[PDB]
Amino acid sequence: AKRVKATILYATETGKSQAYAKTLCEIFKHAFDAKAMSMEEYDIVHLEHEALVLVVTSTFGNGDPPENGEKFGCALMEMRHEERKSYKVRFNSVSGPLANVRFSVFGLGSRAYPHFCAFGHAVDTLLEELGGERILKMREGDELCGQEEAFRTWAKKVFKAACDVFCVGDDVNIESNDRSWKRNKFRLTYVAEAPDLTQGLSNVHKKRVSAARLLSRQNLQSPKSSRSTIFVRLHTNGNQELQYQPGDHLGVFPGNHEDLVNALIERLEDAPPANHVVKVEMLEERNTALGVISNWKDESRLPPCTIFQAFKYYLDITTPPTPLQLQQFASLATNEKEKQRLLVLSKGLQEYEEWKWGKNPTMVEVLEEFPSIQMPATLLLTQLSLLQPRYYSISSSPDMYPDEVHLTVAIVSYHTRDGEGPVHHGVCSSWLNRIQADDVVPCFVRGAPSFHLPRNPQVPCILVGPGTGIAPFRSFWQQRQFDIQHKGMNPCPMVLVFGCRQSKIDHIYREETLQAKNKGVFRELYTAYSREPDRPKKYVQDVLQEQLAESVYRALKEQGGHIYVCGDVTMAADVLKAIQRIMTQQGKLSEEDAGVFISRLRDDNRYHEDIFGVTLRTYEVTNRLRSESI
């Protein structure tokens, strides 16, 4: 029972928890026999016999487990569950089998969301009730301020605390450094077989990606708008992989703009032409009883391909470097002043914060700001993060549009340095806005069972969502419309609470919702204008408290109706207060009965929320929170 095993479990949606977990395993390799596994890869049957367990997990959606964390969270939730309390009740709330085990939790999250680091807190809370002995109190990493930084602190303490408790680490010492990057470690070797895009992305992200097809794209806003929102039609080609129900999302895999990809490639020192199928092989120095066995292997992260296809379809080249990545960049800088700035930023303290949040630098902008960096083709290919797919609410009814998938996409573009800097185009939205019909569209369907229309047609539904948060409601109404016209049903009509900036500029799908109302689908259509010169600023929160307070109340309290909120997390949080008020001031219930009534609706799946994350007033919201919390 020597060489204590340290099991590092992680859950992630974009790769941050996974990275930190790797870094954490590397550290524990010093005094312990450590392993880093995704929560889904791990077999819950070993847990009770685990000596030490370290959890690094983010939280997603509406205070939920990352998708690859759901199974593990249910499992715990199960072993621990005499009856009561739901996950949504205790951990995302409105205001022993593991005796042998020692653990500690680090959770990633954002103060921009209601239930900050919810999944980390549930796991942390749950391992303790199951009989586990917590080493360090749970620490939280805020994506808005010092996330990578707070990881180090905790990583340091927890290691020290583990060494102390297990009484090992009298030979491990006070301390880049690991599988980071080193020139005699990674090598790009030639290959003659380059997979197909959708097949390569399936390997890379361990899931089946189907090739969809672009049929058309149209502007949903006036040509006189400064903004742009596009209606996109895709042909699924029969593929049963792409079956969906109204409410579900489509995950899409973009391509970085070629110019940016090229600028980047033309800045590498030693790099084959940006065209030669090259696999990446790494010098892996294993270790045996004989001594140390060293040899070449396949990194096996990216599939065989040209560096161009790699930077274009598989690697994140626009997300600002983490402090770690800057550290590897620094040791490549050949200019005194130019290299110290790199080391100052490597800290993740304020300078980093200001630089990142101020310049929102792409990989290219960084190499160009510190032109004395000798960038190795293999450092990027192995250190950059994978290009993540972006999710989009499906905007079509599969009955009204068989073998078709529609999307409503806000075109993200903004100026850096608070309007002074150049333009940065969102990766997926700008891609979806320029692909041609011959272009393949890598995607998959991710069902959203908490956001499907009710099984019972005769109950009232209130659909709340500003801007593109209307996207899924378009599948709701098209679907209800088809039901009426062809299935011979008379479902209780619904109410739509939309919200935008200007009557004849932003009200997307206006006529389309009109036509749907005349057909019985909707009882009434409410709209909140926020930048109308002719009146005051109104938000769906307002339309709800000023013109539906009664309907809302009668719908939810007597008619057994449902309310659906979709879009920006700030709005959704506001809509939850507007409803808590309407419930209080329209039924005489304190912040108690109103809160518990809501908390009940959710419980019974009658209060639905589909969070897009932070999409509205991004600058002002991120700015307020960033500051206010440091």
Ligand X SMILES: NC(=O)c1ccc[n+]([C@@H]2O[C@H](COP(=O)([O-])OP(=O)(O)OC[C@H]3O[C@@H](n4cnc5c(N)ncnc54)[C@H](OP(=O)(O)O)[C@@H]3O)[C@@H](O)[C@H]2O)c1
What phi and psi values does residue 460 have, to the nearest 5 degrees? -80, 140
Alpha helices in 14-146 (DSSP H): 16-28, 70-79, 87-90, 118-129
Hey, how many other C-beta atoms are within 10 angstroms of the C-beta on 13?
Answer: 19
Residue 409, strand partner residues? 230
Alpha helices in 433-568 (DSSP H): 473-486, 510-518, 540-546, 549-557
For 37, half-sphere exposure in the C-beta direction (CA atoms, 13 angstrom radius) is: 15
Distances, alpha carbon 541 to alpha carbons 326, 581, 582, in Å: 43, 11, 11
412 contributes a contact to ligand X by CB under 6 A:
yes
14 is in an annotated binding site: yes
58 contributes a contact to ligand FAD by CB under 6 A:
no
356 contributes a contact to ligand FAD by CB under 6 A:
no
Query: Are the C-beta atoms of 108 and 55 separated by less than 8 Å?
Result: no
Alpha helices in 167-222 (DSSP H): 197-204
Interface segment toward ligand FMN; rule CB under 6 A; list 7-15, 45-53, 167-175, 197-205: 7-15
573 contributes a contact to ligand FAD by CB under 6 A:
no
Distance (Å, whole) CA 346 – CA 341: 8
Hey, how many other C-beta atoms are within 10 angstroms of the C-beta on 167?
Answer: 8
Instruction: Give the three-state DSSP class for 264.
Output: helix
Q: Write 429-433 long-range contacts (CB < 8 A, 24+).
A: 429/390, 430/257, 431/254, 431/255, 431/256, 431/257, 432/217, 432/230, 432/232, 432/252, 432/254, 432/407, 433/217, 433/228, 433/230, 433/409
135/364 with CB nearer ligand SO3: 364
393 is in an annotated binding site: yes
416/559 with CB nearer ligand SO3: 416
Interface residue with ligand FMN among 25, 34, 47, 61 (CB under 6 A) is 61
251/560 with CB nearer ligand FMN: 251
274/569 with CB nearer ligand FMN: 569
The residue sitting closest to ligand FAD, measured at its beta carbon, is 426
430 contributes a contact to ligand X by CB under 6 A:
no
499 contributes a contact to ligand X by CB under 6 A:
yes
Contacts of 3 (CB under 8 A, 6+ apart): 32, 33
Distance (Å, whole) CA 46 – CA 475: 44
59 is in an annotated binding site: yes
For 397, half-sphere exposure in the C-beta direction (CA atoms, 13 angstrom radius) is: 14
Distance (Å, whole) CA 231 – CA 470: 12
Minimum CB separation of residue 390 from ligand FAD in Å reads 4
What phi and psi values does residue 607 have, to the nearest 5 degrees? -120, 105
- Positions touching a second copy (CB under 8 A) are 5, 33, 35, 37, 40-44, 71, 74, 192-197, 199, 202-203, 206-208, 211, 237-238, 240-241, 243, 245, 295-298, 399, 402, 446-449, 455-458, 482-483, 486-491
613 contributes a contact to ligand FAD by CB under 6 A:
yes
Instruction: Give the three-state DSSP class for 461.
Output: strand
Contacts of 385 (CB under 8 A, 6+ apart): 14, 15, 19, 315, 316, 319
The one-character DSSP state at 333 is: B
Q: Which residue has the tokens 């880049």?
A: 176
Partner from ligand FAD, ligand X, ligand FMN, none binding residue 66, C-beta < 5-8 Å depending on class:
ligand FMN
Minimum CB separation of residue 434 from ligand SO3 in Å reads 5
Partner from ligand SO3, ligand X, a second copy, none binding residue 258, C-beta < 5-8 Å depending on class:
ligand SO3
Task: Say how many Å lie between the first and final Cα of the chain, rounded.
Answer: 44
Instruction: Give the three-state DSSP class for 107.
Output: strand
100/618 with CB nearer a second copy: 100
206 is in an annotated binding site: no
95 is in an annotated binding site: no
424 is in an annotated binding site: no
Residues 422-481 that bind ligand SO3 (CB under 6 A): 434-435
517 is in an annotated binding site: no
338 contributes a contact to ligand SO3 by CB under 6 A:
no
For the chain, how many residues are written? 630
Partner from ligand SO3, ligand FAD, ligand FMN, none binding residue 412, C-beta < 5-8 Å depending on class:
ligand FAD
500/556 with CB nearer ligand X: 500
Partner from ligand X, a second copy, ligand FMN, none binding residue 61, C-beta < 5-8 Å depending on class:
ligand FMN
85/624 with CB nearer ligand X: 624
Residues 204-263 that bind ligand SO3 (CB under 6 A): 255, 258
Query: Are the C-beta atoms of 491 and 477 separated by less than 8 Å?
Result: no
* Number of chain positions touching ligand SO3 (CB under 6 A): 5
Residue ranges for the binding site for FMN? 12-14, 16-17, 58-59, 63, 110, 115, 117, 143, 147
Residues in contact with ligand FMN by CB under 6 A are 12-17, 58-63, 66, 108-110, 113, 115-118, 143, 611, 613
Residues in contact with ligand X by CB under 6 A are 227, 229, 410-414, 466-468, 499-501, 530-531, 537, 539-541, 568, 570-571, 574, 615-618
Residues in contact with ligand SO3 by CB under 6 A are 255, 258, 369, 434-435
Residues in contact with ligand FAD by CB under 6 A are 249, 318, 360, 390-393, 408-410, 412, 414, 426-429, 468, 471, 610, 612-613, 615, 618-619
Residue ranges for the binding site? 12-14, 16-17, 58-59, 63, 110, 115, 117, 143, 147, 227, 249, 390-393, 408, 410, 413-414, 427-429, 468, 501, 530-531, 537, 539, 541, 574, 615, 617
